[PDB]
Amino acid sequence: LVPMVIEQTSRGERSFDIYSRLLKERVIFLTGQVEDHMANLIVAQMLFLEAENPEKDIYLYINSPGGVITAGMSIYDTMQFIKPDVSTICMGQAASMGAFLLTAGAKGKRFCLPNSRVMIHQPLGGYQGQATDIEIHAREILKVKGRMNELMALHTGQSLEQIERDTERDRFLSAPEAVEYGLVDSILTHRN
Amino acid sequence: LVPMVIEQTSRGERSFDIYSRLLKERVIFLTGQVEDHMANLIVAQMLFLEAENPEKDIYLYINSPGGVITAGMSIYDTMQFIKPDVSTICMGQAASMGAFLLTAGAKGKRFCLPNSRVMIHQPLGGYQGQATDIEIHAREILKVKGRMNELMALHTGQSLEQIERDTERDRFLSAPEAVEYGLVDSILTHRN
Amino acid sequence: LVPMVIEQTSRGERSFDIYSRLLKERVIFLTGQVEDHMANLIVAQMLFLEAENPEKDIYLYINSPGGVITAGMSIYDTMQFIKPDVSTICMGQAASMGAFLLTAGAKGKRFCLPNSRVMIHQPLGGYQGQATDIEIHAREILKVKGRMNELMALHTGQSLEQIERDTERDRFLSAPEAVEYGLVDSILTHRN
Amino acid sequence: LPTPHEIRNHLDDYVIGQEQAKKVLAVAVYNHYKRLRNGDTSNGVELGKSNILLIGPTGSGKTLLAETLARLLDVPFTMADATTLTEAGYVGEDVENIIQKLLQKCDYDVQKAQRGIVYIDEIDKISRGEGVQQALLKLIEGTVAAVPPQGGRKHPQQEFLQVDTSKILFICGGAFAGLDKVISHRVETGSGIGFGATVKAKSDKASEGELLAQVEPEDLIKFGLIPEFIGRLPVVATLNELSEEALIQILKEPKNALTKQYQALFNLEGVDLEFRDEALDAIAKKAMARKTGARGLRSIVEAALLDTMYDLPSMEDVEKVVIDESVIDGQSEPLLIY
Amino acid sequence: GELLAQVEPEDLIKFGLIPEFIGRLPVVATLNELSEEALIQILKEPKNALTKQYQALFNLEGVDLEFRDEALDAIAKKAMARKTGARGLRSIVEAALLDTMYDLPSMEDVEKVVIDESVIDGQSEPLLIY
Ligand SMILES: Nc1ncnc2c1ncn2[C@@H]1O[C@H](COP(=O)(O)OP(=O)(O)O)[C@@H](O)[C@H]1O
């Protein structure tokens, strides 16, 4: 059950759900397996906040084990499109897609919690059918692999060759290791 | 759950769902497997917006893997019937049915995000029963194939022969490749 | 999640779901397989609208792959029973039961979109049990078949013999073909 | 006491395109003056006042129709707005303040004030404050309001002048934009969203003319007006719209036409002015898009002539001046003849 | 600016003005917020300009005041933010010269004082010539 909170305003007392109250403060929660429906919801929140104030910065809290690539690209493309800088904070973990979205945040505004765990791997897919169809889908996933690696190299700042080697197999990076790799910029240890 | 949002108006503060709030701005979300139930909901949204302001454009956001042809065709006929132009934007991906609706958008208003993937294929179906019945259903699906290819050629601008050859098997098109093919017009890289 | 729309009038502002907002305009949506529960809901809408105004026309948007015959007759008898003329518009498709309700609409107020598919076939049924019971049920379904053919011939205007030969097996029809056959009166292509 | 036909002729001189509305006001105003003229009241029957209700779009001539009648038959004229009196606090002092304003024009003559014509506008806004309507109906039904005698430092209750509002003609003008939809629902098909519905919102609004003419008390109550207030407004006059072509005629056809006013100003200066027909369409088109009706015509013409008016007195050798559609756009300069 | 130009009678009525009063005033002259360039001219071009006023004030004490061309641009920028029009200029000048005016009478050997753009920002102190 989602709890309800009261917000004091000039008009009077107002009741909001815990998630909507934080949305009012430009906070979007990315939680669980990435998919088309949850991604479209996040896209709607980014566009809504852009209109309210295109100057202020938006925040994205990523705690997810990854998911569909196509759904993630909808979020990634939306972040780069809108004028507001999107700050990404990793809570708990950030897998292949969560990590791609984490590093896709605005340069200097990417954060990670101290005990967080980041993991990056290459795309995984499968197709059953004729050899001709296999060649088509096989070429498509390879293109996505190259495209994802090219974008990660840009945000992380590492060379494309290095990304291919590291993403060939699952690689787990802690919060300090991620800072060196370039996935995140700083760690939020304590409130200052 | 969907996060509620507040809209300021002359009467006072008003509460709207995230999707309903965007619907007020002539934005319709086409998400997931196309089926009769969701299609009738999109049709109702279009007709409602037409009454409010037939001059203003409508924006359809497509992120779906395709689905039933009859359900998708009810959306296409609705778009062409109504006077306002229906702009189509592709987020994440637009498969066979999603691509037909995408290219069916108003000329010059079709858009695609840079990392979106547009796949087009021919109709697929099946029937079990007597040979006489199989002949009836086989002729019907073939007629549907020609109808879809005829319309796709009209919107894309390519010849019917080329569309038939290209759609004989699954064909994946990136956002730039789609521009040359004619499925879309421009790519929304960044807000200007 | 159906969206909520706001209707603004001098008295005030009211919020309705998309389906209920269109109901005020005498628009009833028939979607999915026909059954007792969904049909009962459609019947209640017809009686409610008849009470509000028995002179204004009622619109029925049909998109359904047929269903139970008994449930359909409730809708058909209700349409003829009430004074208001019930208009029928085929969106996407209209199978055996949907087509029967489509052609059952008021003369001159039956429409179909250009890409709609209309299919008509004879009733389907089965019974397991003693030979004596089989004869009872077999006679019943044949009586239903003759009754449906007679009604379809009346609305379509075709001869009873022609309807029997055509409905022996599935007969897919297009919007232009339906006009000449008599199932529909006109095709709605563009608002003009 | 001229006949209604004669009154309509006077209105036709300054107002064009609202012939139907002129007829309703001509007969209605004629009856009001006939009752005042028939002060003898020989018959046992007591005559009752008839109040008109004007329903038309903005800048359609509602206000102009009020004072124009007073110009023909000399009577004091005052105007009020419902938004000013929606305060709902001490409404009694403001309703009597309106006649006090009217009394100023008539030299504070109670008899002359009673014969005066009062006008109001924007009645749609109050329809939904309900309480404001309760006070307004009393003024239309008839009420005696005390007013101070021609101002003064102070005066006792005895000297206060009381004027009966039963003999005053009240015209409660308004612009009911959303009422047309209510009438279409009642008269035409009750479908506005579906495929078979009529959503031809081309902005022509030609159908609105005959649609609003079918106004009945039922559609008004839906708009929020209480039935008691509607009963006190038996006469109803409806203005259809001011078309683009109609605006062109208003620029020159009226007696004190806008073009004539500017032309006269240039004539005394020593140079005549010529308005080409091409310039008229540009001005009319701008007003239609701006939605100002005839009101914007004055502003558009002044802006176009502002530059030349500044330099023409200083400049010389301009035998004649001409204007064209290009000048209205602002890219071109008014042609000068030497 | 560019908003008051679209003023109409309906908005004036909401403010409280009587509708009859508005109709009697057809001509409407709407002014616009002074620009940076306009404020710069007022600082020196008028005979009774703000700079000349302080120059006469300093001259009464036996010192001459000089204003750099760049300083006027900075003063105009600060004045525009205040939104008080021409009066905003006096606020900036009084603040920048508050310290020197307090100590200038007590100080000796001061024959000339110069102000530049850096002084307007407040990071620098008024330049003194000895
Ligand atoms: N047919 C017309 N002929 C001349 N002037 C008109 C006409 N219709 C409107 N006007 C102008 O419109 C102005 C009144 O506008 P306003 O009172 O705001 O709305 P309404 O015209 O509905 O009363 C008048 O000054 C008048 O000059």
Side-chain angles (χ1 to χ4, degrees):
Chain A
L1 188 144
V2 184
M4 285 284 189
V5 306
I6 295 298
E7 170 52 29
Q8 305 302 133
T9 65
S10 61
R11 297 184 174 279
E13 272 187 349
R14 209 176 288 163
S15 183
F16 282 111
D17 50 293
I18 195 72
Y19 292 115
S20 297
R21 181 67 180 84
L22 265 63
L23 175 55
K24 196 161 169 287
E25 300 294 342
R26 314 185 76 72
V27 171
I28 294 156
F29 274 87
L30 198 165
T31 305
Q33 206 72 226
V34 175
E35 53 91 19
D36 292 5
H37 291 94
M38 66 89 75
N40 284 118
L41 194 70
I42 289 159
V43 168
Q45 294 179 59
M46 290 182 177
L47 299 168
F48 169 75
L49 295 171
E50 189 193 2
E52 292 290 332
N53 197 329
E55 299 294 345
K56 291 176 80 70
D57 65 332
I58 291 159
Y59 299 89
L60 188 66
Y61 295 179
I62 294 151
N63 183 4
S64 50
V68 187
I69 300 101
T70 56
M73 311 331 290
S74 61
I75 296 159
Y76 168 80
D77 292 325
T78 305
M79 293 147 74
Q80 305 300 313
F81 178 82
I82 65 185
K83 275 173 65 54
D85 291 0
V86 176
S87 175
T88 54
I89 296 141
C90 177
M91 312 195 308
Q93 62 164 357
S96 63
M97 294 310 315
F100 183 80
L101 300 173
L102 175 67
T103 188
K107 187 72 180 299
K109 297 185 175 186
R110 303 171 295 179
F111 308 107
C112 202
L113 275 69
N115 286 265
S116 287
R117 193 67 55 174
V118 175
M119 193 267 280
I120 61 188
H121 64 69
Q122 56 163 304
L124 61 90
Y127 188 77
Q128 283 68 236
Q130 292 184 311
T132 314
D133 301 328
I134 289 160
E135 206 283 335
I136 291 156
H137 287 73
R139 281 194 289 90
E140 178 55 31
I141 197 172
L142 291 166
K143 283 185 172 66
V144 172
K145 180 180 168 186
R147 181 58 172 166
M148 274 177 64
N149 290 345
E150 283 172 5
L151 297 170
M152 287 183 74
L154 187 85
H155 296 295
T156 60
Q158 305 290 121
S159 62
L160 178 55
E161 283 72 14
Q162 194 69 50
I163 296 284
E164 294 170 2
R165 292 196 292 272
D166 298 336
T167 58
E168 204 72 1
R169 290 186 175 284
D170 299 6
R171 183 177 166 83
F172 295 79
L173 304 106
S174 57
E177 294 178 338
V179 172
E180 301 173 4
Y181 203 79
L183 291 152
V184 306
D185 303 315
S186 60
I187 292 155
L188 299 177
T189 310
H190 288 101
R191 178 74 80 175
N192 302 124
Chain B
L1 72 166
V2 302
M4 292 290 174
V5 288
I6 299 300
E7 171 169 3
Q8 292 277 259
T9 181
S10 297
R11 303 186 75 83
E13 64 89 22
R14 182 162 50 191
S15 59
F16 274 109
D17 190 3
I18 191 66
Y19 290 118
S20 310
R21 180 67 182 85
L22 266 65
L23 178 61
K24 188 168 172 57
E25 305 299 336
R26 310 181 79 72
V27 173
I28 294 157
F29 277 94
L30 193 154
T31 296
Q33 200 70 226
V34 173
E35 57 171 353
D36 296 321
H37 289 99
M38 65 169 264
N40 276 329
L41 193 72
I42 288 158
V43 167
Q45 290 160 269
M46 289 175 171
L47 299 169
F48 170 75
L49 295 173
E50 189 191 11
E52 293 289 338
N53 198 330
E55 282 73 29
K56 288 178 77 66
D57 294 356
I58 292 160
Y59 303 92
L60 184 67
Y61 295 178
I62 294 151
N63 182 14
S64 49
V68 186
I69 300 106
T70 55
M73 194 55 48
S74 62
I75 295 154
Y76 168 89
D77 291 328
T78 306
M79 293 148 71
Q80 302 296 310
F81 179 83
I82 63 185
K83 195 156 72 70
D85 293 330
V86 175
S87 185
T88 51
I89 295 147
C90 175
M91 311 196 304
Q93 62 163 10
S96 50
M97 215 67 230
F100 182 76
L101 303 174
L102 174 69
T103 190
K107 189 71 172 294
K109 302 187 192 299
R110 304 166 296 178
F111 303 114
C112 198
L113 298 178
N115 289 280
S116 287
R117 291 286 178 171
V118 181
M119 191 268 281
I120 47 156
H121 64 66
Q122 61 166 315
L124 61 89
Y127 190 76
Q128 302 283 126
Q130 291 193 131
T132 304
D133 299 330
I134 292 155
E135 206 284 333
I136 289 159
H137 287 256
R139 284 195 288 90
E140 176 56 25
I141 197 174
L142 289 167
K143 281 185 286 189
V144 170
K145 186 181 173 182
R147 189 71 271 188
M148 276 172 62
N149 289 339
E150 278 173 7
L151 300 172
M152 177 159 284
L154 180 78
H155 296 289
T156 58
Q158 302 220 329
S159 59
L160 183 63
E161 283 72 7
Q162 196 69 46
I163 297 294
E164 189 171 356
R165 293 194 297 271
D166 290 357
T167 194
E168 197 69 9
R169 288 186 170 284
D170 297 1
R171 190 189 177 83
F172 292 86
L173 279 85
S174 60
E177 296 172 355
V179 171
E180 287 88 57
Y181 207 81
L183 291 164
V184 306
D185 301 313
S186 305
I187 295 158
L188 303 174
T189 61
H190 280 69
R191 186 180 282 284
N192 306 124
Chain C
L1 185 136
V2 307
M4 306 299 290
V5 292
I6 302 304
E7 191 191 356
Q8 180 163 222
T9 184
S10 304
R11 178 58 174 180
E13 290 184 353
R14 285 205 289 284
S15 71
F16 316 82
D17 51 298
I18 194 70
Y19 292 121
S20 300
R21 179 66 184 84
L22 269 62
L23 178 54
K24 286 177 71 59
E25 308 301 335
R26 312 181 79 72
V27 171
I28 292 154
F29 274 94
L30 197 157
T31 300
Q33 282 76 353
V34 181
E35 51 173 1
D36 295 4
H37 293 112
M38 68 89 74
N40 182 25
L41 194 67
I42 288 158
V43 167
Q45 293 181 61
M46 290 173 171
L47 303 172
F48 165 74
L49 293 168
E50 191 190 5
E52 293 291 345
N53 197 320
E55 282 75 29
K56 287 167 175 171
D57 297 359
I58 290 162
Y59 301 91
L60 184 67
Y61 298 173
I62 295 154
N63 186 6
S64 50
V68 180
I69 301 97
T70 51
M73 309 328 294
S74 69
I75 294 158
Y76 167 80
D77 294 328
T78 302
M79 293 147 67
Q80 304 299 323
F81 173 69
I82 65 183
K83 269 165 56 48
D85 294 330
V86 177
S87 186
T88 51
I89 294 144
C90 175
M91 310 195 309
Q93 61 162 2
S96 49
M97 214 70 239
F100 188 84
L101 303 173
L102 176 65
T103 191
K107 194 74 175 295
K109 298 175 180 169
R110 306 172 294 174
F111 312 104
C112 61
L113 301 175
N115 296 286
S116 300
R117 308 302 305 188
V118 173
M119 194 267 282
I120 47 167
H121 65 67
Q122 62 175 329
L124 269 79
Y127 185 79
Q128 275 67 21
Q130 297 180 288
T132 300
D133 296 329
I134 292 160
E135 176 58 18
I136 290 156
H137 283 261
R139 276 156 42 203
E140 177 57 22
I141 204 176
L142 293 172
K143 283 183 288 189
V144 169
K145 174 171 165 183
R147 180 56 171 163
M148 278 174 65
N149 289 345
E150 285 172 4
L151 298 172
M152 185 168 279
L154 182 73
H155 297 295
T156 49
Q158 299 289 117
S159 60
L160 180 60
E161 283 72 16
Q162 194 70 63
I163 294 284
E164 286 172 0
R165 299 191 291 270
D166 296 357
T167 193
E168 268 290 359
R169 292 176 180 283
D170 297 358
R171 190 187 178 80
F172 294 90
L173 279 76
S174 304
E177 300 180 354
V179 170
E180 58 177 0
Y181 201 76
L183 296 153
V184 303
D185 299 317
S186 177
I187 312 181
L188 299 173
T189 311
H190 285 83
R191 195 189 283 285
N192 280 317
Chain D
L1 185 61
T3 60
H5 177 241
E6 291 172 0
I7 292 156
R8 187 190 151 284
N9 301 331
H10 181 261
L11 295 172
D12 289 320
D13 300 334
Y14 307 95
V15 183
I16 52 174
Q18 301 294 352
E19 278 68 5
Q20 179 56 27
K22 293 171 190 119
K23 195 198 182 191
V24 178
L25 290 172
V27 63
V29 76
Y30 179 80
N31 299 333
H32 185 81
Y33 276 71
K34 177 159 278 183
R35 294 147 186 165
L36 298 163
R37 183 68 184 78
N38 190 28
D40 297 332
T41 316
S42 63
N43 300 112
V45 72
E46 285 283 299
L47 310 178
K49 166 165 65 173
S50 54
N51 303 276
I52 310 99
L53 163 52
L54 301 168
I55 296 162
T58 60
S60 61
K62 296 187 288 299
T63 298
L64 177 57
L65 284 158
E67 51 267 11
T68 43
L69 289 165
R71 291 171 180 170
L72 181 61
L73 289 167
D74 48 357
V75 293
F77 162 73
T78 196
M79 173 165 62
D81 183 40
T83 47
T84 57
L85 314 191
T86 192
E87 57 207 51
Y90 299 132
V91 176
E93 79 196 41
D94 58 53
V95 297
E96 63 83 12
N97 180 273
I98 293 161
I99 59 169
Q100 159 53 15
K101 186 179 284 181
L102 191 75
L103 279 156
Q104 291 156 10
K105 312 210 185 194
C106 84
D107 318 327
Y108 297 98
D109 289 330
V110 176
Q111 301 298 267
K112 201 169 158 188
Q114 284 183 129
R115 298 188 63 178
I117 315 304
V118 176
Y119 175 76
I120 311 170
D121 206 330
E122 289 80 53
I123 294 281
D124 57 346
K125 269 68 173 186
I126 54 165
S127 181
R128 78 195 190 186
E130 296 293 327
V132 178
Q133 303 187 50
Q134 300 294 124
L136 280 162
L137 67 94
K138 275 276 184 171
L139 185 64
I140 313 312
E141 177 60 26
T143 303
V144 67
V147 184
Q150 62 95 30
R153 79 291 190 282
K154 192 172 184 180
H155 291 287
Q157 62 272 26
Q158 301 91 296
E159 214 183 349
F160 264 73
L161 300 172
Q162 293 177 357
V163 186
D164 195 349
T165 58
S166 298
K167 298 184 177 182
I168 293 167
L169 188 68
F170 291 82
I171 294 160
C172 311
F176 298 78
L179 187 69
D180 59 356
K181 189 180 282 293
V182 177
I183 296 160
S184 181
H185 185 260
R186 176 169 59 76
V187 175
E188 303 184 352
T189 189
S191 57
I193 289 163
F195 289 96
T198 49
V199 306
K200 304 292 184 170
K202 189 252 181 180
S203 184
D204 58 357
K205 299 291 102 179
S207 296
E208 194 179 19
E210 59 262 39
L211 192 66
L212 291 175
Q214 308 181 55
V215 67
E216 292 291 345
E218 39 262 46
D219 70 4
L220 299 180
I221 54 166
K222 299 301 301 306
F223 205 94
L225 291 161
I226 59 172
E228 209 284 341
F229 186 62
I230 293 157
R232 312 311 188 190
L233 300 165
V235 180
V236 174
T238 297
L239 309 167
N240 46 307
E241 184 52 51
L242 292 185
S243 61
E244 194 274 348
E245 194 276 326
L247 291 164
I248 292 162
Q249 307 309 308
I250 293 163
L251 288 169
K252 54 179 183 297
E253 293 204 342
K255 281 170 170 167
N256 56 23
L258 188 67
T259 57
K260 295 172 191 169
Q261 291 170 50
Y262 290 107
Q263 281 166 4
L265 179 57
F266 284 106
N267 291 338
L268 60 90
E269 190 179 2
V271 186
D272 293 330
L273 202 80
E274 180 176 357
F275 273 115
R276 292 181 181 179
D277 189 303
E278 302 297 339
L280 304 177
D281 61 67
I283 292 159
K285 281 180 287 188
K286 291 280 283 299
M288 292 289 285
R290 292 162 46 82
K291 310 291 179 293
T292 72
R295 296 164 64 179
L297 303 174
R298 165 157 281 279
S299 62
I300 297 291
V301 171
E302 184 63 26
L305 302 169
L306 197 154
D307 55 337
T308 183
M309 277 173 180
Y310 162 69
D311 62 70
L312 184 62
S314 66
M315 290 173 61
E316 194 50 285
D317 201 1
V318 182
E319 303 298 340
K320 190 150 171 289
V321 173
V322 190
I323 307 94
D324 49 319
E325 62 88 21
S326 53
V327 167
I328 304 304
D329 304 328
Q331 65 196 334
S332 191
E333 205 273 321
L335 180 59
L336 312 181
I337 311 307
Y338 306 90
Chain E
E2 291 91 7
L3 187 71
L4 294 170
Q6 308 182 128
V7 67
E8 301 298 340
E10 56 269 21
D11 58 67
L12 283 155
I13 291 159
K14 278 185 282 182
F15 192 87
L17 265 56
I18 286 166
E20 289 71 20
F21 205 84
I22 294 153
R24 286 292 93 185
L25 275 47
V27 180
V28 172
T30 181
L31 278 58
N32 53 4
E33 69 296 341
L34 307 184
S35 299
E36 296 289 314
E37 49 263 28
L39 293 160
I40 290 159
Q41 308 312 316
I42 293 166
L43 274 158
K44 58 181 186 298
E45 298 294 345
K47 64 190 293 302
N48 300 334
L50 189 66
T51 57
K52 296 176 179 170
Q53 282 183 358
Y54 290 104
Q55 283 169 357
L57 190 71
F58 276 63
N59 288 324
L60 179 57
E61 197 172 329
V63 187
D64 51 357
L65 196 65
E66 185 177 352
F67 287 101
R68 294 289 186 78
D69 301 331
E70 292 82 348
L72 312 194
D73 189 1
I75 290 158
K77 230 180 187 180
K78 300 283 276 290
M80 180 170 287
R82 291 183 66 80
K83 316 207 190 306
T84 55
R87 283 133 175 170
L89 302 166
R90 193 173 285 273
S91 297
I92 308 305
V93 173
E94 283 286 2
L97 278 62
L98 172 52
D99 55 356
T100 183
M101 291 165 89
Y102 161 72
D103 57 58
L104 172 58
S106 293
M107 281 188 72
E108 290 77 6
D109 196 78
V110 176
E111 72 284 357
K112 159 167 277 293
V113 175
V114 187
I115 297 94
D116 67 327
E117 68 278 16
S118 67
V119 168
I120 307 306
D121 301 328
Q123 63 187 359
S124 170
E125 282 70 358
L127 179 57
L128 271 69
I129 310 306
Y130 306 97

